[PDB]
Amino acid sequence: VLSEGEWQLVLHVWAKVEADVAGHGQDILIRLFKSHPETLEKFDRFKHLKTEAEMKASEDLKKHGVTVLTALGAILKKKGHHEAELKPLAQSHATKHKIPIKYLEFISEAIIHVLHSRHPGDFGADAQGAMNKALELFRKDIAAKYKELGYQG
Numbered sequence: 001v002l003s004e005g006e007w008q009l010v011l012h013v014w015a016k017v018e019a020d021v022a023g024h025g026q027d028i029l030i031r032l033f034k035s036h037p038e039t040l041e042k043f044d045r046f047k048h049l050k051t052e053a054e055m056k057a058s059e060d061l062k063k064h065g066v067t068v069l070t071a072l073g074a075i076l077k078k079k080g081h082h083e084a085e086l087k088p089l090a091q092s093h094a095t096k097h098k099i100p101i102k103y104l105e106f107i108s109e110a111i112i113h114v115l116h117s118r119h120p121g122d123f124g125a126d127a128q129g130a131m132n133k134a135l136e137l138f139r140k141d142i143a144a145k146y147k148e149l150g151y152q153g
């Protein structure tokens, strides 16, 4: 479990992300798509996007970036009492979108990279450590719901 002081480092940087949810959402999905191109194939919406310039230009992509970061934000603010927010998410991503747990690892890495670019001063080593622990807790709880449904994978 994260300590109270670790949750404080997580939500202090998240308050800064909320100053520009759209810009953050974009950078993160673009990082994910460039780093792990197999993740782009899961999106019938975005599959057509070939270059980083096209990705940057897409309004629909920025719109989905907002959706993802808003959902994640609602989860983080529950500080690990996140069961009501997490279970709908795991159910759609396992059974409808078919998203392997490993891709949730990949997007965690993207989030940490972008938080590091945008917020050096608020995202030093202990904030980075806390953020990693928080995203691990997210994955761990999703994984458990996947296993239940027969998707552990």
Ligand code: HEM
Pocket (backbone or CB within 6 Å): 039, 040, 042, 043, 044, 045, 067, 068, 069, 071, 072, 088, 089, 092, 093, 097, 099, 103, 104, 107
């Ligand atoms: C921080 C992690 C993530 C969060 C908070 C998240 C959140 C969401 C939300 C809230 C929706 C709309 C409601 C729903 O269908 O559940 C959605 C849709 C979806 N997500 Fe995620 N997601 C995450 C990770 C991923 C990853 C890693 C992939 C792809 C590798 C993925 C693929 C999709 C797809 C394909 C859809 C449907 C998109 C469409 O409208 O066509 N998600 N996600």
